[PDB]
Design a binder for these strands. Sequence first.
DNA 1: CCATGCGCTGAC
DNA 2: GTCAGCGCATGG
Length: 327
Amino acid sequence: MIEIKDKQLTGLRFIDLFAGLGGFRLALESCGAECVYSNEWDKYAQEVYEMNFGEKPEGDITQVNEKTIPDHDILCAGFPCQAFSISGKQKGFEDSRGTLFFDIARIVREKKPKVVFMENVKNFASHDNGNTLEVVKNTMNELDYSFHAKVLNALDYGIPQKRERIYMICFRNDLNIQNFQFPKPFELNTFVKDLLLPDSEVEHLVIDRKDLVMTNQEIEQTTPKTVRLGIVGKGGQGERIYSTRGIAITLSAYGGGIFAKTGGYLVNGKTRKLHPRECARVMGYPDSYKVHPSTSQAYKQFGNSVVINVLQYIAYNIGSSLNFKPY
DNA sequence: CCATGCGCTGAC
DNA sequence: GTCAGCGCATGG
Ligand SMILES: *C[S@@+](CC[C@H](N)C(=O)[O-])C[C@H]1O[C@@H](n2cnc3c(N)ncnc32)[C@H](O)[C@@H]1O
């Protein structure tokens, strides 16, 4: 994450829905805001959350009475994406995991917060010939809110990872906000090679296979893109090997293959996958965050999360707009 | 719960 | 024609 000197969100309160590891919480707290409610139903995720923030989140949002939720200024939500991802079956609103958006709407109707901040995958903007996004935009308009949305790539904000996502920002109409803007991209200067741990600590992740087929030579200069060097098996998800002089492929939660969820890399002459701590680093988390003792739950949690740095820039811009009040 | 072989879609 | 994907399916 980045250091913020000008704390634009001092005095404001927020709630953390579909909490996970708390990526939305780290970002907003660094800007000066205070968290007054959290919700998440997974046993293992509630354990890391409590380990790091000192509180246990509430369970199943579909059966929580929206009137019991505390007053707040900003609602945060990185809702489920299996029903919209290009890697799944694309069932959309027909999917039992695809209706969570209407629960958010239910809460927004009652509490009427100043800002709604949401995140989902890139395919969300294209799904069902554009109907899915129009449905979300019209619902927010009907509740008396404006709608701003755009797809941003993590590699343009200083983190070496190809992770394209859609961010949706909404302001209550009586506030009359007319100067909000998404942050501007800058040049990348850090690469996969600069975030790795010492060879001694990662010996156990090395994989030596006999069907390894190199198809490209190692590159001699760094570059802001994914560079594939070789393959194992039939070359499907989890069987592709990349260079550490380039950037990392997007991390997943339920992925398979011998190099599952992280992908494989050529390091000092050997091929291996990433360690949980290196996953924390490519997601923008500080070395002081404590990970789950179970390696299996840790990879799943990081693959479902958000890049901290990108949210910090967006949150600062939300505060700047709220504070501009001339006579 | 955990590990790993798959097979199709979207955007070039 | 080439390449990537906060995923699915089945074995123990
Ligand atoms: C995909 S993920 C959010 C990650 C988070 N932004 C981060 O780690 O920083 C979605 C999370 O939502 C939880 N979830 C799914 N359905 C429910 C219901 N109905 N009630 C509560 N929580 C739910 C998932 O377990 C996941 O962690």
